Design a protein around this ligand. Structure first.
Ligand SMILES: Nc1ncnc2c1ncn2[C@@H]1O[C@H](COP(=O)(O)OP(=O)(O)OP(=O)(O)O)[C@@H](O)[C@H]1O
Ligand SMILES: Nc1ncnc2c1ncn2[C@@H]1O[C@H](COP(=O)(O)OP(=O)(O)OP(=O)(O)O)[C@@H](O)[C@H]1O
Ligand SMILES: [Zn+2]
Lengths: 603, 604
């Protein structure tokens, strides 16, 4: 197939002359674009007579109804829109497209050239006639007899500009997406453009292509590969230090990943605690609301309060309340609502079903109820904003105490790992208080991921036994990793993720704030990132800490001077990579992460 | 700063009319480019006279010496080549670039528009003059007085096309890189260009940009990000099954990574063995050459010969030959030469220095000699072709033999890990036994990576012990992972690399070859790849197996039906990520891997 597109102005001989570009072979069909000027109607009638006298290929003449003459840039813009739509309609395939640029204004020929360059064309050529005609024998063909004699005498020279490859993302557009209206006035069509959707789309695609090519060199330094389409100014903004007050909206709109979120520390105080209590199935058995005065300056304490006091601050919830089915359901639904409000795309909630068991409610029943509450919450949310939740069972070694709870939690995890295979799942266990792995072989045998929850001890020996004796894949609260260079190198090389909770660490350990340089007591985020460690920022306890994931992300701007927004994105990508999700969950999380919000202050 | 660029044809009045685009402000710099036709000269004197008055802006007129008419498209190409250089020299900055396409040929205005699009400019506009001038008041202004009247009567209409950013790869181009030969003839510069390098550069840049845009969609499925610049036909070629016979040249040129290579099994026979023996320091203690007949059909045996016979095949080299300093030096140099010939960019060599020690040569001396030979060989190679070599110490359990060597090798590795920090290094220890949990705590405490060299058995329990008790980061010859589903899932999730040797596994174990479809006994390479396991292809014993890394990669096509060359690239990337390298070595390896050879038979 071969389709020829030609533009005509005051001279009608351009079409018959360009029809002889291929010689005796001819064109399978020639299409002519025309303006609305009345000065060209005799040209149109002569072209129609020529076409009738030369039957064969399909003929169609298109006139721009709204373009009578070139008076301003608006007329040229409308002509460009109409020409693009007409080329799409009459030339669906760029390999079958032949374009002639003899006729039209000096801008119209450039319009055809640009259209061929963008949307592609098999060949773009210019038809010329040797001046030997007229009464003086110096003009070119102008009448039917003159055009016929010019074609016969071979007074025509064609300038073949060569095929135009076009662009990959503009070579796939189709006419039905952007239709064109044509009013037939005799054998010539009168076309018009209803709107400029096609041109706006083309301009946006070209701008996106320019953005992609500009940042193409150096794309491996970007966390999200889809982030390379950002404008260079926005990337420069991304490479700047985070502002805790200016970037609140951007951090809030970010799709985040949660990995350290204790379920029993969500509704410890405030209105959420009363909302949970009012949902109790047996309201008479609710324990009295004791007085738990928060330290002054919460959530930013003046001085560190210690792990024991931090634990004691959450005595109004947990095993006291969640032994009631109604309180447990309310806690689960409120936690899911809080996760949705913070734009979290993947969360791993760690719970202790054994603590919540009753005489008639075994730990298995409690775990099943928690899983079903989370699954029902997930299934009631649209997939475009659904936060996938997985469960970690918390086995804790307490001072003295009984070892039955640890065994029960391990067995419950080892059972739930195979019971559920879709939706909310038990993805692993975390070992809090354990350096002693003799009963942890079965969890490794069944493929359960293990994360070790580091405690008050600032012992490098604990982070060693977690890595090489507990076979931990994530370390929680590993703030003293830099004290042993060998351990830091091992953690970086083996890809063990270090999950950090800014507010919890500040309230328990305490770190300098709003510094200008990196000190000896400074928060170890930037040091870990510079060493190649996979660092993740989490919330720990939403209720006790009284800070969401966005607040934790923003607080790094104060804890670590010079923290950049790209490093926040790096932490999010590290959390996504370190999650215990499967293939489908990981691909869904990656799809969610690609939708990075656009900045609001340019650069 | 505002520079105006205009073309001039038969009508010189276009430049003065375009001079009033901004109004009274004018242009701080205006340049005129035209052809060498004699008809352009009177327009030249008219423009010079017009520049005599209104002397505000800077003036210059350029004429293409070799371009006069539109009678040759090659003239058009030369005109474009001179045009781009003239625009770069006269309009170095696109932001300060104001281009007018009123004058000149239609192709001249097209060149104006194309140059503005490619290189960028602040504004492209067309100037229109009312015909209410000249005799009869029916022609556009063409004289000094007529032009001034048109300017002073608001008779000029301007069509500002709008700002054009230009492509990123063409905006940073500089005039000095593409000089223009200008000769002064009065107030006009006669410009000429010696080479068409600018046009070729532009064409290559646009072609590469088109390829990158086409491949942008599938950017996460490409193991090497540099493959996005490949043409779409080549990318489609990359996704077809590997052909062992027609893809040998492409595989031979690939920058490969070696993770499983034994030093003592490189020159077990052939002319390499004779060269190593000739290089002996004392040619009287050399053991007599033992007659070891290779199994028929080598390197592709008719039937698998087992591990014991495969080990015995290399009895002419190793412990009973490498105790000679000259033999050891020749061994190391020949191994490095073989590595270079295969285009290997990173290699990890496994050696047993204790087995090569004598009364006057302690294991440390042997290890230091091996390291220094490899480092010296590396330093004599250019950095662009240099193959970085690291060392792995093999601690092999014996069948109730010696136990002192298993400790001496570990101590030697722990010492060498701290001794050397640049060039060749000892990066880990190889465990060829227990596949001992109390013997490797010191290894882990110093940051040494351990690779478990499984073999001569099919037991998932050994793999479990290696992964969880030995803390192995790589597994060798783990061909039975699929038999245990939990083990396969754990290996996939923990990012443990599996070192597969095609020729060695085929010779020892035996697998079906050239089978049309996969089966129960098929090679587990593609099954491992589909499960998310990081698989690597190595050589094991270069000498005993009698096959190079390229041979192994090609034979993987026969072992695994319908394997694509993109899978080969994926295996190379997996080997690069699984190497026990540091930041500098890893970045150098990544830089080397980015130079994927271009395919040659992408025509079907
Ligand atoms: N930041 C922390 N540091 C140390 N231990 C913690 C921390 N947060 C929670 N824990 C411990 O985790 C254990 C189990 O966590 P979970 O979130 O399931 O709490 P819980 O069962 O509701 O707690 P409780 O009933 O003791 O208040 C609890 O015993 C708590 O002591
Ligand atoms: N393909 C293999 N499969 C299993 N074990 C192997 C393999 N190749 C080598 N080994 C083990 O590695 C040890 C060292 O092999 P290497 O190639 O370095 O030669 P070597 O030091 O001369 O060996 P040897 O002690 O047999 O003389 C061998 O003794 C054997 O224990
Ligand atoms: Zn081996």
């Amino acid at each position: 197939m071969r389709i020829l597109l030609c533009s005509v102005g005051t001279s009608w001989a351009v079409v018959p002359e360009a029809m002889q570009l291929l010689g005796s072979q001819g064109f399978d069909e020639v299409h002519v674009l025309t303006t609305a000027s009345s000065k060209i109607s005799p040209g149109v009638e002569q072209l129609l007579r020529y076409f009738e006298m030369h039957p064969g290929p399909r003929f169609s003449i298109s006139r721009v109804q709204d373009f009578e003459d070139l008076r301003s840039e608006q007329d040229h813009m409308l002509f460009e829109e109409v020409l693009w739509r007409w080329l799409l309609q009459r030339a669906p395939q760029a390999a079958h497209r032949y374009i002639c640029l003899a006729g039209g204004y000096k801008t119209i020929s450039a319009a055809m050239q640009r259209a061929a360059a963008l949307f592609g064309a098999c060949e773009v050529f210019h038809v010329l006639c040797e001046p030997r005609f007229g009464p003086q024998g110096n003009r070119e063909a102008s009448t039917l007899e003159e055009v016929e004699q010019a074609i016969a005498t071979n007074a025509l020279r064609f300038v073949r500009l060569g095929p135009e490859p076009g662009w990959p993302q503009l070579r796939l557009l189709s006419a039905p997406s952007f239709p064109l209206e044509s009013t037939l006035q005799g054998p010539v069509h009168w076309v018009r453009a209803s709107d400029m959707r096609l041109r706006q789309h083309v301009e946006g695609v070209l701008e996106r292509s320019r953005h992609i090519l500009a940042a193409w060199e150096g794309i491996s330094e970007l966390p999200i590969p889809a982030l390379a389409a950002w404008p260079p100014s926005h990337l420069r903004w991304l490479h700047e230090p985070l502002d805790p007050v200016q970037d609140k909206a951007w951090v809030q709109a970010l799709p985040k990943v949660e990995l350290h979120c204790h379920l029993g520390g969500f509704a410890t105080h405030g209105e959420l605690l009363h909302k949970v209590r009012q949902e109790a199935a047996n309201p008479e058995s609710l324990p009295p609301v004791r007085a738990i005065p928060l330290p002054p300056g919460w959530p930013i304490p003046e001085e560190p309060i210690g792990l024991e006091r931090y634990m004691r601050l959450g005595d109004n919830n947990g095993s006291a309340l969640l032994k009631d089915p109604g309180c447990l359901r309310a806690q689960c639904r409120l936690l899911y609502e809080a996760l949705l409000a913070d734009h979290v795309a993947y969360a791993e909630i760690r719970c202790s079903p054994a603590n919540y068991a009753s005489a008639s409610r075994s730990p298995w029943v409690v775990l099943q109820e928690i899983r079903n509450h989370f699954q029902q919450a997930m299934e009631e949310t649209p997939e475009d904003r659904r936060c996938h939740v997985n469960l970690l069972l918390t086995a804790t070694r307490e001072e003295g105490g009984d070892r039955s709870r640890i065994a029960r939690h391990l067995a419950l995890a080892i059972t739930a790992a195979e019971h559920w295979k879709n939706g909310c799942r038990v993805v692993g266990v975390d070992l809090a208080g354990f350096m002693f792995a003799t009963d942890f072989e079965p969890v490794h045998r069944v493929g359960l991921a293990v994360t070790v929850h580091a405690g008050e001890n600032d012992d490098v020996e604990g982070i060693w036994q977690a890595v090489f004796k507990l076979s931990a894949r994530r370390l929680g609260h590993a703030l003293h990793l830099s004290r042993s260079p060998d351990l830091l190198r091992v953690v970086a090389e083996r890809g063990i993720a270090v999950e950090l909770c800014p507010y919890a660490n500040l309230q328990i350990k305490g770190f300098p704030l709003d510094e200008e340089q990196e000190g000896s007591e400074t928060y170890p985020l930037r040091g870990y990132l510079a060493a190649g460690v996979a660092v993740t920022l989490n919330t720990d306890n939403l209720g006790i800490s009284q800070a969401s994931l966005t607040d934790n992300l923003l607080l790094t701007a104060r804890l670590c001077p010079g923290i950049t927004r790209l490093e926040v994105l790096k932490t999010q990508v590290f959390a996504a990579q370190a999650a215990f999700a499967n293939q489908a969950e990981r691909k869904a999380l990656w799809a969610r992460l690609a939708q990075v919000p656009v900045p609001t202050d340019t650069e």
